[PDB]
Amino acid sequence: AIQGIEGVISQLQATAMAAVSFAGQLHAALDRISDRQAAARVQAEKFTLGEPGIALNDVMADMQKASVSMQMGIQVRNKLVAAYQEVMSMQV
Amino acid sequence: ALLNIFDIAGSALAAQSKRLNVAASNLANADSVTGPDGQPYRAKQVVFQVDAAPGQATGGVKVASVIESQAPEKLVYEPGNPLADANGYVKMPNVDVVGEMVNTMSASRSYQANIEVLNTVKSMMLKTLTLGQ
Amino acid sequence: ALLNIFDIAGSALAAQSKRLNVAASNLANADSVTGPDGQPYRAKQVVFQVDAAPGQATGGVKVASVIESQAPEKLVYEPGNPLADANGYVKMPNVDVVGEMVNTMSASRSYQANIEVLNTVKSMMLKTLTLGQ
Amino acid sequence: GGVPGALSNQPAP
Amino acid sequence: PGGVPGALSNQPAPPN
Amino acid sequence: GVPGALSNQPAPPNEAPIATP
Amino acid sequence: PGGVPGALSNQPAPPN
Amino acid sequence: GVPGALSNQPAPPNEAPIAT
Amino acid sequence: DRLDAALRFQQEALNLRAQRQEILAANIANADTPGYQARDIDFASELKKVMVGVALTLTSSHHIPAQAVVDLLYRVPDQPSLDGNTVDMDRERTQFADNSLKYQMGLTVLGSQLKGMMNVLQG
């Protein structure tokens, strides 16, 4: 927005005068896990395509690693949900 | 398409089959006087080349073409034959017997060795797929 | 640090696959006479090294380079074949068939052992993920 | 690298 | 320093 | 081209005469 | 319309 | 040393010569 | 459905492998037919074609819904036979074994994807 760019220049002036988070970390972990899974899937599709240079060994090992990473994410989600339920059960 | 080992060993099998076919055709035509046109049968040879798809690394075997041997055709004095020349020598093929039997044996043993290689690899191939599940 | 076993065993599997491929390529061309450049096929072999960067204690295995096998070229007396020498000494590859068959069997067995390592490691990783639950 | 693996798709594409 | 695995390095090598 | 490839055309009939026509 | 397999169809015979 | 035991010193390079 | 889009590629690859397996076994079975041409399909191109329809409209209950209802390439012959049969044993045996292996690999990959989608839900 024009007013949005005004706000950007205002924050730049703020930085001039003056002279990441848990949700961010969880988003980063989800992005990393999804990127690994997509990479393994893409390599598997490339091997199924018949394109040269892709070895079945690498495909199978990468699928294995992607499965392990997915399971790790599932466990982290399970615990995190359990901890949230425990906190919300506190009587004030 | 094929896995690299499959392609290499299958090319080996096909090349050995072609060599065996050439040997059998030579052994059949050992006593032929004429072809379909009026020229003597010439012993065929098969030339093996390495089908090095990458640069000098590996590759199976391919057969460029079946060449006709250049050896003195056997001359038999039969002036009554219509195919005799001015001097009267009919031309018989240059097919040697011992060489063709040795070629048949060698082609058979290479064929069987490549078959054994494929059979050995196969179990490892099927056992690879259990890694994920 | 059970994740490093994935890298170690994957590198080992790839190296053994390359070794088996090279052995099969040598075996399939034992009877070859010509290459793409006209040179005789030279038996080739991989070189195994510890896949450890400077300062790394123990790693998997890696294929450094593919080298021509050191053995006299098999001389065959056939001064009728179009490919020949000055004295008719056709040069054929120095492939030792027994060595290649034993190499193929050894590569397959080592490959299967590494697959077992990977399988049990993944099972342990899952069980570790089920630590407290 | 220079050598493709045995379990790889035909180098010839 | 590694070397060639299998047949080549398990057959009696030449002296030099 | 290479033996074992894929083509959209059937191979010609395999005739082997005994005498030249 | 395939014909006889094996021996009979793998012998050189004049066309009719 | 007992085979299968652990020692801090590496085994010497082994050789199989043809002629002494 | 989004679930179809995730599993579309592997299902189509598995179906194409089964069809090519049937074609190769037909080539094996008809090895002795004189005049039979060995046919095959190009796996990659057909997989592109399948990966890359209009159910007729049903106004009421009685209206009947729409009723639903690959290209074969000739193999280049290697050796000339006398009976016109171009089926080669070695080539198609290797192709048959390879197709079996790839069918097993596709089954493994599809099963792994379904099992992952399942353990995401189990709880």
Give the distance from residue I97's alpha carbon to the nearest chain G alpha carbon, in angstroms. 26
Task: Enter the DSSP assignment of B29.
Answer: G
Q: Which residue has the tokens 């590496």?
A: H10
Best of C21, C61, C67 to disrupt the D interface (most D CBs within 10 Å) is: C21
Strand partners, B60: B51
Rounded to whole angstroms, the Cα distance separating B16 from A91 reads 83
Give the separation between CA B105 and CA C81, rounded to whole angstroms.
20
Among candidates C48, C67, C100 on the partner chain, residue whose Cβ is nearest the Cβ of E5? C48
**Angstrom distance (rounded) from CA F14 to CA F5:** 19
Asked if B35 and A84 count as a contact pair (C-beta separation under 8 A), the reply is no
Cα separation, B92 vs B76, whole angstroms: 7
- CA dihedral I110→I111→I112→I116, nearest 10 degrees, is 110
> Positive or negative CA dihedral for I16, I22, I25, I26?
negative
Which of C:3-42 have CB within 8 Å of A?
A: 6, 9-10, 13-14, 17
Encoded tokens for C77: 């007396």
Q: How far apart are CA I41 and CA G11, in angstroms?
A: 32
Pair B1, D9: CB distance under 8 Å: yes
CB pairs under 8 A between F and I: 40
Tell me how close the Cα of A44 comes to any Cα of chain D, in angstroms.
12
Nearest to B7 among D3, D5, D10 (CB): D10
φ/ψ bin of B88: left (φ > 0), alpha (ψ from -120 to 50), beta (otherwise): left
Residue C27 with chain D: CB contacts under 8 Å:
none
On whether any CB of chain B is under 8 Å from the CB of A56, the answer is: yes
> What is the Cα Rg of chain E in Å?
8
- CA dihedral (A6, A12, A13, A18) positive or negative: positive
Chain F interface includes B14 (CB < 8 A): yes
- Three-point CA angle F15, F17, G1, nearest 5°: 35
| Positive or negative torsion for Cα C29, C30, C32, C36 | positive
Interatomic CA distance for residues B115 and B121, integer angstroms: 10
- Of all helices (H) and strands (E), which one includes residue B90? strand B89-92
What lies within 8 Å, CB to CB, of A74 at 6+ separation is I119, I120
I36 neighbors I75 (Cβ within 8 angstroms) = no
Alpha carbon distances (Å) from A49 to B92, C68, I44, I101, I102: 54, 33, 6, 14, 11
CB distance B36–F4 less than 8 Å?
no
Q: Reported resolution in A?
A: 3.4
Enumerate the β-bridge partners of residue D3: none
Query: C48, E11: Cβ pair inside 8 Å?
Result: no
Interface E:H, ≥3 CB–CB pairs < 8 Å = yes
Q: How far is C30 from chain E (nearest CA, A)?
A: 16
Query: Which chain A residues touch D5 with a CB distance below 8 Å?
Result: 55, 57
Interface touch F4/I83, C-beta < 8 Å: no
Under a CB-based contact definition with an 8 Å cutoff, are residues C27 and C44 in contact?
Answer: no
Q: Is G15 exposed, middle or buried (0-12, 13-18, 19+ CB in 10 A)?
A: exposed
- Helix (H), strand (E) at residue C99: helix C97-129
Say if CB G10 and CB I84 are below 8 A apart: no
